[PDB]
Amino acid sequence: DDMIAAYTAALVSGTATAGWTFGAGAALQIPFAMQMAYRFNGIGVTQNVLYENQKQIANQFNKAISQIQESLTTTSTALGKLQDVVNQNAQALNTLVKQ
Amino acid sequence: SISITTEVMPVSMAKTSVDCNMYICGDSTECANLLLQYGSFCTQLNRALS
Amino acid sequence: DVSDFTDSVRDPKTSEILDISPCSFGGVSVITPGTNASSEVAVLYQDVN
Amino acid sequence: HVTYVPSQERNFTTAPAICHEGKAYFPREGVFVFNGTSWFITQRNFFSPQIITTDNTFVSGNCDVVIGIINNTVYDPL
Ligand SMILES: *[C@@H]1O[C@H](CO)[C@@H](O)[C@H](O)[C@H]1NC(C)=O
Ligand SMILES: *[C@@H]1O[C@H](CO)[C@@H](O)[C@H](O)[C@H]1NC(C)=O
Ligand SMILES: *[C@@H]1O[C@H](CO)[C@@H](O)[C@H](O)[C@H]1NC(C)=O
Ligand SMILES: *[C@@H]1O[C@H](CO)[C@@H](O)[C@H](O)[C@H]1NC(C)=O
Ligand SMILES: *[C@@H]1O[C@H](CO)[C@@H](O)[C@H](O)[C@H]1NC(C)=O
């Protein structure tokens, strides 16, 4: 589990520092606001819309992250198929023992 | 030219269910009592089909 | 027990209850290179410290 | 599979927009780079400097709300 966490941390750090370039080749650094303007340009929205509304977009991003973090402590229906995987393996072995 | 092409794809199939007691023994209680040793072999089949 | 294996017995002379356990336990793996490379192997025992 | 791989990178200074005559100019397709002498506009995958004209850029608003806005000049052909 530590190595998988290390892999995901490396992926998230590379996204937050180098953007999209490190998937193809080496990592090419870019400040995060210019990368987000490049992502906005790839939908159809122009580049100025990010730079003129940067604080609102950052606040909405942080609030959505906090919403997911508050939701994961409460609800239990999420992660409902990993539990199905482990339950099915356990039930198969117990059925072998009981047969 | 403007062309229209058709493409057909399957989505589901028929849902089926079986009863071991009616399939294997029928209506005889001797076979029904002899089938209790083979007890966990049909809860498995019903679980798979459901 | 649950798998109809005789696990408990009462002694006919000095009437006490005893459990019977199997005496084979734990998985074993053999690590080898090719047979044409060498005849030396390593053994890994799970479930032992 | 025949693919294109970029290589031999170098670092430049960059700005989001440039403020000229009280209005903010944003690039169309590229980034503003500074190489130690003057500011150019380049494509992101290959380094080929171009001078900053009115055709490379577009105007949006005044230079008071962008963070990182700088002062430079924009070449008009007439
Ligand atoms: C003989 O069996 C009785 C149980 O009926 C037991 O109490 C006694 O200890 C046994 N004798 C010996 C010598 O173990
Ligand atoms: C094996 O025994 C040592 C001795 O205390 C202990 O520190 C270690 O945790 C044990 N190994 C496992 C896997 O529990
Ligand atoms: C990028 O190039 C600049 C030169 O303008 C240099 O100062 C800087 O150290 C370089 N970045 C790295 C990570 O070496
Ligand atoms: C920056 O690029 C221009 C483009 O030709 C060049 O003339 C100038 O010398 C470059 N600056 C440096 C410091 O190399
Ligand atoms: C850009 O020009 C304006 C007005 O000419 C001035 O107020 C501002 O300080 C300048 N910016 C810099 C970084 O010098």
PDB file of all heavy atoms in Angstrom, chain D residues 19 69-71, ligand 5:
ATOM      1  N   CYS D  19       0.246  44.727 -20.524  1.00  0.00           N
ATOM      2  CA  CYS D  19      -0.545  45.951 -20.473  1.00  0.00           C
ATOM      3  C   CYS D  19       0.098  47.000 -21.369  1.00  0.00           C
ATOM      4  O   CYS D  19       1.251  47.386 -21.155  1.00  0.00           O
ATOM      5  CB  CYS D  19      -0.668  46.473 -19.043  1.00  0.00           C
ATOM      6  SG  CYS D  19      -1.253  48.179 -18.930  1.00  0.00           S
ATOM      7  N   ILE D  69       0.444  40.951 -14.519  1.00  0.00           N
ATOM      8  CA  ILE D  69       0.440  41.812 -15.693  1.00  0.00           C
ATOM      9  C   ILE D  69       1.725  42.633 -15.741  1.00  0.00           C
ATOM     10  O   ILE D  69       2.262  43.046 -14.704  1.00  0.00           O
ATOM     11  CB  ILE D  69      -0.824  42.691 -15.664  1.00  0.00           C
ATOM     12  CG1 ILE D  69      -0.970  43.528 -16.931  1.00  0.00           C
ATOM     13  CG2 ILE D  69      -0.878  43.555 -14.410  1.00  0.00           C
ATOM     14  CD1 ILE D  69      -1.342  42.737 -18.140  1.00  0.00           C
ATOM     15  N   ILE D  70       2.258  42.832 -16.949  1.00  0.00           N
ATOM     16  CA  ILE D  70       3.497  43.574 -17.153  1.00  0.00           C
ATOM     17  C   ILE D  70       3.267  44.645 -18.211  1.00  0.00           C
ATOM     18  O   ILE D  70       2.241  44.674 -18.891  1.00  0.00           O
ATOM     19  CB  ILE D  70       4.667  42.670 -17.583  1.00  0.00           C
ATOM     20  CG1 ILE D  70       4.338  42.019 -18.916  1.00  0.00           C
ATOM     21  CG2 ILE D  70       4.966  41.623 -16.530  1.00  0.00           C
ATOM     22  CD1 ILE D  70       5.487  41.312 -19.532  1.00  0.00           C
ATOM     23  N   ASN D  71       4.253  45.528 -18.348  1.00  0.00           N
ATOM     24  CA  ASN D  71       4.230  46.596 -19.336  1.00  0.00           C
ATOM     25  C   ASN D  71       5.164  46.256 -20.489  1.00  0.00           C
ATOM     26  O   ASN D  71       6.321  45.886 -20.267  1.00  0.00           O
ATOM     27  CB  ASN D  71       4.650  47.931 -18.722  1.00  0.00           C
ATOM     28  CG  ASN D  71       3.706  48.405 -17.642  1.00  0.00           C
ATOM     29  OD1 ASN D  71       2.828  47.670 -17.198  1.00  0.00           O
ATOM     30  ND2 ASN D  71       3.884  49.648 -17.216  1.00  0.00           N
TER      31      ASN D  71
HETATM   32  C1  LIG E   5       3.060  50.237 -16.195  1.00  0.00           C
HETATM   33  O1  LIG E   5       2.631  51.554 -16.584  1.00  0.00           O
HETATM   34  C2  LIG E   5       1.742  52.185 -15.650  1.00  0.00           C
HETATM   35  C3  LIG E   5       1.348  53.512 -16.256  1.00  0.00           C
HETATM   36  O2  LIG E   5       2.281  53.928 -17.244  1.00  0.00           O
HETATM   37  C4  LIG E   5       2.428  52.329 -14.294  1.00  0.00           C
HETATM   38  O3  LIG E   5       1.511  52.884 -13.358  1.00  0.00           O
HETATM   39  C5  LIG E   5       2.918  50.971 -13.806  1.00  0.00           C
HETATM   40  O4  LIG E   5       3.659  51.124 -12.601  1.00  0.00           O
HETATM   41  C6  LIG E   5       3.800  50.313 -14.861  1.00  0.00           C
HETATM   42  N1  LIG E   5       4.223  48.993 -14.424  1.00  0.00           N
HETATM   43  C7  LIG E   5       5.478  48.716 -14.059  1.00  0.00           C
HETATM   44  C8  LIG E   5       5.743  47.303 -13.639  1.00  0.00           C
HETATM   45  O5  LIG E   5       6.360  49.568 -14.069  1.00  0.00           O
END
